[PDB]
UniProtKB/Swiss-Prot annotation, chain B:
It catalyses: [protein]-peptidylproline (omega=180) = [protein]-peptidylproline (omega=0). It comes from Methanocaldococcus jannaschii (strain ATCC 43067 / DSM 2661 / JAL-1 / JCM 10045 / NBRC 100440). This is Long-type peptidyl-prolyl cis-trans isomerase. Residues 5-92 form the PPIase FKBP-type domain. GO terms for cellular component: cytosol. Disulfide bonds: none annotated.
Length: 223, 224
């Protein structure tokens, strides 16, 4: 069993109706058609049982051990939630034609700034589902606990990556109460890096009781 | 003389037709009415002869010594430019009325943002002068070279202040071609501080040719 609040690194592959919809395995993601060039793959760090993942995943993780691999089946209540009937709405077909849109099943459209999926067309009404795509669905996860991170240096490294995935190679130095974090050359250019830094620092101070301060170093070279 | 590229701190008072329009002196800006709460006054650092001041003013500085003070009368070509006759145009009066504007002679208005002074109104036509306000005017400066900033540490500090006036108190250390700048507690919250930091680093690396890197240190304390 893994204790609530423990930082763990996990790998997983998430299936719905036989199909892979999410994974930390880059190669598999490629093989299976869902690869996102913006996403950073590989094992992910979470604080166990704190709500960083699906509730059913949090529950499964807390009863596993390090090195343990496992497959869990989660009901919608524990995954992406039940399908709310209030979010499935009949919209007059004229609302589409007037805008020059041919409604087709599976088309994503937006109404009032809210996205929905076209579910069916009958007579002069288009049924559009504004629920989460995986709402009401049972989902399966391959999950493995890769490691427990219990050293200060790596807790900090992982907290940084948790808040900013692209920052996977930061240099951390613990010096009696001071957490020094040297950032890569590209870091200063990250959108709202400053908010991110403050969040990272706040997370570090919460986890490392002996830390008095968190100091970030940004370096600009002759490039 | 001062060499081009040298950092100097200067103090000055600028005059048009005998009236003060620009200054580094806090009190003299208020007493004369030209004060602006968003401006940090006092000696300001420039790089000599690089166009951070009016051209007539740069060229004076290049021929001055540290501590020297002099009056410099600048012709329009070296100040805000010469009056350009092609910028004084006849505009149909209907252009004003369409915009809800009442045109009065001598009274500055804006047309589509761009401001202008109404010279006259005649037979459904408005003659508007769109020259810079101080165009064609001779301006007179009282300028003193307060100090030359010659030492690496103060060059860095002044560069910081040049880009972000509020960062007047930073800790600087230089070791093995690395310039380290430790920032105060409020630094990370400054608007567009990331762009300011790259700007400061660029300037530092330009001025200190022995520098290989510029490092900024931001520190978050245990609510303190």
């Amino acid at each position: 069993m893994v204790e609530k609040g423990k930082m763990v690194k996990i790998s997983y592959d998430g299936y719905v109706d036989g199909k892979l919809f999410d994974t930390t395995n880059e190669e598999l993601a490629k093989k299976e058609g869902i690869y996102n060039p913006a996403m950073i793959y590989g094992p992910v760090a979470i604080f166990a049982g704190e709500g960083q993942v699906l509730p059913g995943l949090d529950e499964a993780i807390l009863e596993m051990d390090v090195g343990e691999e496992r497959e869990v089946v989660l009901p919608p209540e524990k995954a992406f939630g039940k399908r709310d009937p209030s979010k499935i709405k009949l919209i007059p077909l004229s609302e589409f034609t007037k805008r020059g849109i041919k409604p087709i099943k599976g088309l994503t459209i937006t109404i009032d700034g809210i996205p929905g999926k076209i579910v069916s067309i009958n007579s002069g009404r288009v049924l559009v589902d504004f629920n989460h795509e995986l709402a009401g669905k049972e989902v399966k996860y391959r999950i493995k606990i890769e490691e427990v991170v219990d050293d200060k240096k790596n807790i900090v490294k992982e907290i940084v990556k948790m808040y900013v995935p692209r920052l996977s190679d930061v240099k951390v130095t613990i010096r009696n109460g001071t957490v020094k974090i040297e950032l890569p050359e590209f870091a200063p250019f990250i959108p709202n890096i400053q908010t991110a830094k403050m969040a990272i620092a706040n997370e570090i101070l919460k986890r490392l009781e002996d830390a008095e301060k968190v100091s970030f170093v940004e370096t600009f070279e002759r490039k």
